[PDB]
């Protein structure tokens, strides 16, 4: 855990796609989330009760990490990707959002650069992914299929 | 998000089944759960620390939304529906719980009316769904299958 947490950040999209579990494992487990799960009492805890302001700040940090995690999982579920780090969809690429070939982006761009190129199309793409899944379920409820 | 949140409430069960992502998206995202995830500090936060009672009420609301969400997801997992908004099971309908044909309920009833008709059979049905999944796993652990 955290042995190369953002190690692929400067690498290409292709190479970086091979380290996806590395970042996923660090979204729900900060130091305080490890101390909170010791078999022994952590001892510190009395401090956070005697002084309730510190107790509240710690809980807010823990609750937020959980809420952010769950929201990303909910979107993957809605889009039809329950689990999987990499999933294919039926939404075609518009070639307006970005107009580059596969041999250019997977080999020459980093994920940070990509993110800064299509950031204002994010909501359009997410909207289409949701519509696609709804259409798929409508087709599933037809026993003659395709 | 929230552009027709309960819009299908007065519609029939059939039509309403086509809007399921609309309600699902609003279970983990109230206004305070959006403000809490800004890149900038929300600014308000000092108020909830200076006066710890308000800080606690806000956390209780956030924790509860998460617990309710997770409990529903756990039941779907137990019943054998990981993900999916609509899933088929192997539990037969009893015709005691409700005794109507498909052409009557999917076209003439709303979900609110349905809920008020079979509410005291809810636990029986949930119990059967769990038993069904356990039986399925017992059959899966047999390499000769069916």
């Amino acid at each position, epitope marked *: 855990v955290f042995l190369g947490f953002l190690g692929a950040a400067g690498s290409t999209m292709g190479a970086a796609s091979m380290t996806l579990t590395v970042q996923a494992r660090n979204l729900l487990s900060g130091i305080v989330q490890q101390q909170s799960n010791l078999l022994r009492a952590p001892e510190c805890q009395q401090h956070l009760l005697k002084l309730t302001v510190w107790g509240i700040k710690q809980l807010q940090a823990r609750v937020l990490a959980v809420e952010r995690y769950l929201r990303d999982q909910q979107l993957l579920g809605i889009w039809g990707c329950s689990g999987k780090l990499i999933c294919c969809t039926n939404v075609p690429w518009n070639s307006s959002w970005s107009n580059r070939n596969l041999s250019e982006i997977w080999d020459n761009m980093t994920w940070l650069q990509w993110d800064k190129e299509i950031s204002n199309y994010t909501q359009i793409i997410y909207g289409l992914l949701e519509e696609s899944q709804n259409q798929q379920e409508k087709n599933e409820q*037809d026993l*003659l299929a*395709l | 998000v929230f552009l027709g949140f309960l819009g299908a409430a007065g519609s029939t069960m*059939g039509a309403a089944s086509m809007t399921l992502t609309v309600q699902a998206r609003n279970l983990l995202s109230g206004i305070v759960q959006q403000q809490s995830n800004l890149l900038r500090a929300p600014e308000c936060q000092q108020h909830l620390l200076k006066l710890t009672v308000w800080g606690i009420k806000q956390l209780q609301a956030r924790v509860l939304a998460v617990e309710r969400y997770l409990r529903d997801q756990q039941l779907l997992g137990i019943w054998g529906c990981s993900g999916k908004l609509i899933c088929c099971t192997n539990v037969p309908w009893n015709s005691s719980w409700s005794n109507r044909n498909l052409s009557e309920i999917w076209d003439n009833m709303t979900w609110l009316q349905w809920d008020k008709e079979i509410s005291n059979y809810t636990q029986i049905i949930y119990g059967l769904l769990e038993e069904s999944q356990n039986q399925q796993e017992k059959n899966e652990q047999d390499l000769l299958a069916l």
Partner: antibody
Amino acid sequence: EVQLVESGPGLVRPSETLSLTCAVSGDSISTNNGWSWIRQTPGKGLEWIGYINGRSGSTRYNPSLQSRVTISTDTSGNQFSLKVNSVTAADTAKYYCAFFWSTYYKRFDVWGPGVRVTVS
Amino acid sequence: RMTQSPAILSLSPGERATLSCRASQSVDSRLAWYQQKPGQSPRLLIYDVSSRATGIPDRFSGSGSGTEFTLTISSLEPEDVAVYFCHQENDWPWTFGQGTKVEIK
């Protein structure tokens, strides 16, 4: 509610292609997937030929005719048709136009009267 | 992939008629029955083994699972002379049984 009306040659010769059509009244064939052809052959009974999905144009054909039958639509005429290549005496049968609705909520069929086709 | 039996039944009016159908492979619960009167195209009677189609008399019923199925007509009437067909709905080939006849004397 729809009505299905078949029409076509009542006689086809060996190695000729048989072409039958079906008009649809009361609803659209550009949608309502499940437009199909069924064959009733004396001495064999009923079998499927195949069907078409009006919304996408895709088709499925019973494997026995996988290399012999084409099903397509005329959505302007709101009619659909069946063509079977290399027709032989063994293909003499009563042919039917049918609409099969099978979903999670409803099940029903509509059948036309059909066309009897003699094959020499 | 399904066989009906017997080829023909002959019954007195009001008598109960039963027809069997056996699959070579499981068809789950996906079985439909049809009634074809001479000069007519087949009418759907029963679907999903025991569900009645809209407009079907309560004389008609059925049961079965997997590979073993039965069509039953109680209180058989003269208007029920027809060829009855067994239809597979659990696989792509959708085969039909050969059809059996029930005649009222």
